[PDB]
């Protein structure tokens, strides 16, 4: 329940299927990581509360809380949590997904699939979106943010 970035694990043997963000008592990750499954946290259970396949997002225990957005000019940091590796910050200037519905920041960074759900941060340390839904041109991830 403590604020922070978390590995999402599954069990012959354990593997890391993704990453998520605890903030304000709500767990945020990408739909394709959990497919909405309930999550164990210690002796507790986290149940899904909101989700959307088109945004590829899911929240547990309450509504989506993350609302900061890329400012369109500044460098950002991916707080990548790869399987078997300590959480690490990768700084980058995002590119842009141009869509009919507006521009979305995108990061041209390619980490293992179990890194999906890792947060992208602005200079104030606020989560501007999650990593792991994108396109190949070399993989480029949207900076996927929900609505608060």
């Amino acid at each position: 329940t403590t604020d922070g970035v978390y590995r999402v694990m599954t069990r012959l043997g354990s593997t890391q299927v993704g990453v998520g963000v605890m903030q304000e008592g709500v767990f945020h990750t990408m739909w394709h990581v959990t497919k909405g499954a309930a999550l164990r946290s210690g002796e507790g259970r986290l149940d899904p509360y909101w989700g959307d396949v088109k945004q590829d997002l899911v929240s547990y225990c309450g509504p989506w809380k993350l609302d900061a957005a890329w400012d369109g000019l500044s460098e950002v940091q991916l707080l990548a949590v790869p399987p078997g590796e300590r959480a690490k910050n990768i700084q980058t200037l995002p590119g842009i997904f141009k869509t009919k519905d507006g521009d979305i920041g995108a990061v041209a960074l390619d980490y293992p699939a179990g890194t999906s759900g890792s947060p992208i941060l602005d200079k104030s340390g606020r989560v501007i979106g999650l990593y792991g839904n994108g396109v190949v041109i070399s993989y480029v991830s949207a900076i996927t943010q929900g609505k608060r």
């Binding site: 978390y6 088109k54 707080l79 980058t92 842009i96 519905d101 396109v135 041109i137």
Partner: protein
């Protein structure tokens, strides 16, 4: 199959961060299944 979470860190900016990656500008479409695809 049970899924569980393990804390891995604080959400914090790091001054001594490695810096890498390009900044491509791409035209894309987003379909109903959440899949992005390139557009020309």
């Amino acid at each position: 199959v049970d899924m569980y979470i393990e804390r891995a860190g604080d959400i914090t900016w790091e001054k001594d961060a490695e810096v890498t990656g390009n900044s491509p500008r791409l035209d894309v479409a987003l379909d109903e299944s959440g899949d992005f695809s390139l557009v020309e």
